[PDB]
Enzyme design. Sequence first.
Site, PDB file in Angstrom:
ATOM      1  N   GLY A  24       2.495   8.055  -8.027  1.00 35.22           N
ATOM      2  CA  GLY A  24       1.081   7.961  -7.731  1.00 35.22           C
ATOM      3  C   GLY A  24       0.270   8.546  -8.870  1.00 35.22           C
ATOM      4  O   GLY A  24       0.825   8.875  -9.926  1.00 35.22           O
ATOM      5  N   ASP A 151     -13.804  -2.657  -6.622  1.00 34.79           N
ATOM      6  CA  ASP A 151     -12.512  -3.052  -7.209  1.00 34.79           C
ATOM      7  C   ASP A 151     -11.609  -3.835  -6.222  1.00 34.79           C
ATOM      8  O   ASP A 151     -10.403  -3.604  -6.116  1.00 34.79           O
ATOM      9  CB  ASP A 151     -11.806  -1.868  -7.874  1.00 34.79           C
ATOM     10  CG  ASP A 151     -10.739  -2.220  -8.865  1.00 34.79           C
ATOM     11  OD1 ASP A 151     -10.655  -3.400  -9.253  1.00 34.79           O
ATOM     12  OD2 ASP A 151      -9.973  -1.318  -9.248  1.00 34.79           O
ATOM     13  N   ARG A 155      -4.162  -6.162  -5.922  1.00 33.23           N
ATOM     14  CA  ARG A 155      -3.484  -4.889  -6.279  1.00 33.23           C
ATOM     15  C   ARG A 155      -4.009  -3.697  -5.437  1.00 33.23           C
ATOM     16  O   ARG A 155      -3.291  -2.737  -5.251  1.00 33.23           O
ATOM     17  CB  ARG A 155      -3.631  -4.567  -7.778  1.00 33.23           C
ATOM     18  CG  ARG A 155      -5.053  -4.202  -8.207  1.00 33.23           C
ATOM     19  CD  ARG A 155      -5.216  -4.011  -9.718  1.00 33.23           C
ATOM     20  NE  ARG A 155      -6.644  -4.039 -10.053  1.00 33.23           N
ATOM     21  CZ  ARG A 155      -7.320  -5.147 -10.345  1.00 33.23           C
ATOM     22  NH1 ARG A 155      -6.694  -6.313 -10.436  1.00 33.23           N
ATOM     23  NH2 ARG A 155      -8.622  -5.101 -10.530  1.00 33.23           N
ATOM     24  N   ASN A 156      -5.246  -3.802  -4.917  1.00 32.44           N
ATOM     25  CA  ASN A 156      -5.930  -2.790  -4.113  1.00 32.44           C
ATOM     26  C   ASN A 156      -5.933  -3.072  -2.608  1.00 32.44           C
ATOM     27  O   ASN A 156      -6.748  -2.500  -1.879  1.00 32.44           O
ATOM     28  CB  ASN A 156      -7.349  -2.585  -4.665  1.00 32.44           C
ATOM     29  CG  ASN A 156      -7.272  -1.917  -6.003  1.00 32.44           C
ATOM     30  OD1 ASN A 156      -6.316  -1.204  -6.295  1.00 32.44           O
ATOM     31  ND2 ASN A 156      -8.222  -2.168  -6.857  1.00 32.44           N
ATOM     32  N   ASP A 169      -5.829   2.255  -0.023  1.00 26.27           N
ATOM     33  CA  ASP A 169      -6.345   3.585  -0.345  1.00 26.27           C
ATOM     34  C   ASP A 169      -7.312   3.532  -1.548  1.00 26.27           C
ATOM     35  O   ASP A 169      -6.986   2.939  -2.576  1.00 26.27           O
ATOM     36  CB  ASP A 169      -5.144   4.515  -0.716  1.00 26.27           C
ATOM     37  CG  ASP A 169      -5.550   5.930  -1.061  1.00 26.27           C
ATOM     38  OD1 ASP A 169      -6.564   6.407  -0.508  1.00 26.27           O
ATOM     39  OD2 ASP A 169      -4.820   6.585  -1.839  1.00 26.27           O
TER      40      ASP A 169
HETATM   41  O1  LIG Z   1       1.982   0.446  -4.801  1.00 25.53           O
HETATM   42  C1  LIG Z   1       2.563   1.096  -5.677  1.00 25.53           C
HETATM   43  C2  LIG Z   1       2.994   0.420  -6.922  1.00 25.53           C
HETATM   44  C3  LIG Z   1       2.241  -0.676  -7.370  1.00 25.53           C
HETATM   45  C4  LIG Z   1       2.562  -1.390  -8.536  1.00 25.53           C
HETATM   46  C5  LIG Z   1       3.684  -0.945  -9.240  1.00 25.53           C
HETATM   47  F1  LIG Z   1       3.968  -1.640 -10.349  1.00 25.53           F
HETATM   48  N1  LIG Z   1       4.436   0.101  -8.851  1.00 25.53           N
HETATM   49  C6  LIG Z   1       4.105   0.774  -7.717  1.00 25.53           C
HETATM   50  N2  LIG Z   1       2.792   2.447  -5.461  1.00 25.53           N
HETATM   51  C7  LIG Z   1       3.202   3.501  -6.402  1.00 25.53           C
HETATM   52  C8  LIG Z   1       2.895   4.818  -5.663  1.00 25.53           C
HETATM   53  C9  LIG Z   1       2.854   4.479  -4.175  1.00 25.53           C
HETATM   54  C10 LIG Z   1       2.615   2.972  -4.113  1.00 25.53           C
HETATM   55  C11 LIG Z   1       3.401   2.282  -3.042  1.00 25.53           C
HETATM   56  N3  LIG Z   1       3.032   2.480  -1.772  1.00 25.53           N
HETATM   57  C12 LIG Z   1       3.707   1.878  -0.752  1.00 25.53           C
HETATM   58  N4  LIG Z   1       3.276   2.126   0.527  1.00 25.53           N
HETATM   59  C13 LIG Z   1       2.101   2.946   0.927  1.00 25.53           C
HETATM   60  C14 LIG Z   1       1.112   3.738   0.218  1.00 25.53           C
HETATM   61  C15 LIG Z   1       0.192   4.319   1.154  1.00 25.53           C
HETATM   62  C16 LIG Z   1      -1.040   5.241   0.934  1.00 25.53           C
HETATM   63  C17 LIG Z   1      -0.799   5.659  -0.465  1.00 25.53           C
HETATM   64  C18 LIG Z   1      -0.235   6.459   0.650  1.00 25.53           C
HETATM   65  N5  LIG Z   1       0.627   3.884   2.343  1.00 25.53           N
HETATM   66  N6  LIG Z   1       1.718   3.102   2.194  1.00 25.53           N
HETATM   67  C19 LIG Z   1       4.810   1.031  -0.985  1.00 25.53           C
HETATM   68  C20 LIG Z   1       5.704   0.273  -0.171  1.00 25.53           C
HETATM   69  C21 LIG Z   1       6.575  -0.346  -1.078  1.00 25.53           C
HETATM   70  C22 LIG Z   1       6.227   0.019  -2.380  1.00 25.53           C
HETATM   71  N7  LIG Z   1       5.161   0.850  -2.320  1.00 25.53           N
HETATM   72  N8  LIG Z   1       4.459   1.471  -3.309  1.00 25.53           N
END
Ligand SMILES: O=C(c1ccc(F)nc1)N1CCC[C@@H]1c1nc(Nc2cc(C3CC3)[nH]n2)c2cccn2n1
Length: 302
Positions: A24, A151, A155-156, A169
């Site tokens: 994150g 935004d 991706r968001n 988020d």
């Molecule tokens: O989405 C990505 C991501 C996106 C693009 C990439 F290239 N690598 C990671 N990431 C990286 C950090 C956490 C996140 C992320 N978050 C996931 N689930 C979440 C997040 C939340 C709010 C934030 C707490 N609820 N559920 C999740 C499920 C599978 C993969 N991710 N990745």
Amino acid sequence: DVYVPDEWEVAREKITMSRELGQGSFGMVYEGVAKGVVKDEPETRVAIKTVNEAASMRERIEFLNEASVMKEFNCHHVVRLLGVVSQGQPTLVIMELMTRGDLKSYLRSLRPEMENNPVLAPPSLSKMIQMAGEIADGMAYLNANKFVHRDLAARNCMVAEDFTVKIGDFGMTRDIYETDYYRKGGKGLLPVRWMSPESLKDGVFTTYSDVWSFGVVLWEIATLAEQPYQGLSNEQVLRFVMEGGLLDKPDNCPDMLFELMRMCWQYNPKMRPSFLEIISSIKEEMEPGFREVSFYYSEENK
Ligand SMILES: O=C(c1ccc(F)nc1)N1CCC[C@@H]1c1nc(Nc2cc(C3CC3)[nH]n2)c2cccn2n1
């Protein structure tokens, strides 16, 4: 400066961190389980955001105050904040779990691999409409709550275990889809390929320019998250859009979906439909549960 604990404070003991979801902005994000965060449920599957062990006092306060923006929201189509652990370390922010991650990554995972193996056909218009309504419902809710997103992009948005798409988020930022942002005028990083002509000219963002970006999200769903204006450089995108240039109808994209994109892409922001207007045009096409969970069908929607 100074994070004051409130009703969102959760006892550390109630949280169990298990597997990583990924890196994150302030630290590693985990998957886990929590006690008493969804009423009195003893075991809720949760996402846990952390602040790295080395981080300063200021960074933890910044992390906490930023996540606290989500405390205002309660919508089935907006990823929920469930709690905060600001006492002791590691500092945590507990959020609803979306097992399928971001919408751009989910869409890109649907692309045919090309290795002679059988492949699932691309999302049907019904599945694409379902995603449209969910996003638009989250956005109508945020607009009603006096927010301008700035935004809105695949991706968001986040995908849940059951395929529900939700507005992800806020202010997440850094390390993810860097190429999705451009240093316009050699200044601040902006999502130029998702930006309205007016936000490109004057730097101002409204619900109308959020509507423009929604049109671009529909185009990402339809193309399986291709880069908008793929053949053009960022500078060429700026000229093209401000001059009244539009994205091409994706191959095999139903007219009904392209017409909706074109409504969101009206040059004049005032001619673009509101999120409520978008939902209304597709309400008949949504799964029956939509009438029971959406902001659209809620008492809160005026
Ligand atoms: O989405 C990505 C991501 C996106 C693009 C990439 F290239 N690598 C990671 N990431 C990286 C950090 C956490 C996140 C992320 N978050 C996931 N689930 C979440 C997040 C939340 C709010 C934030 C707490 N609820 N559920 C999740 C499920 C599978 C993969 N991710 N990745």
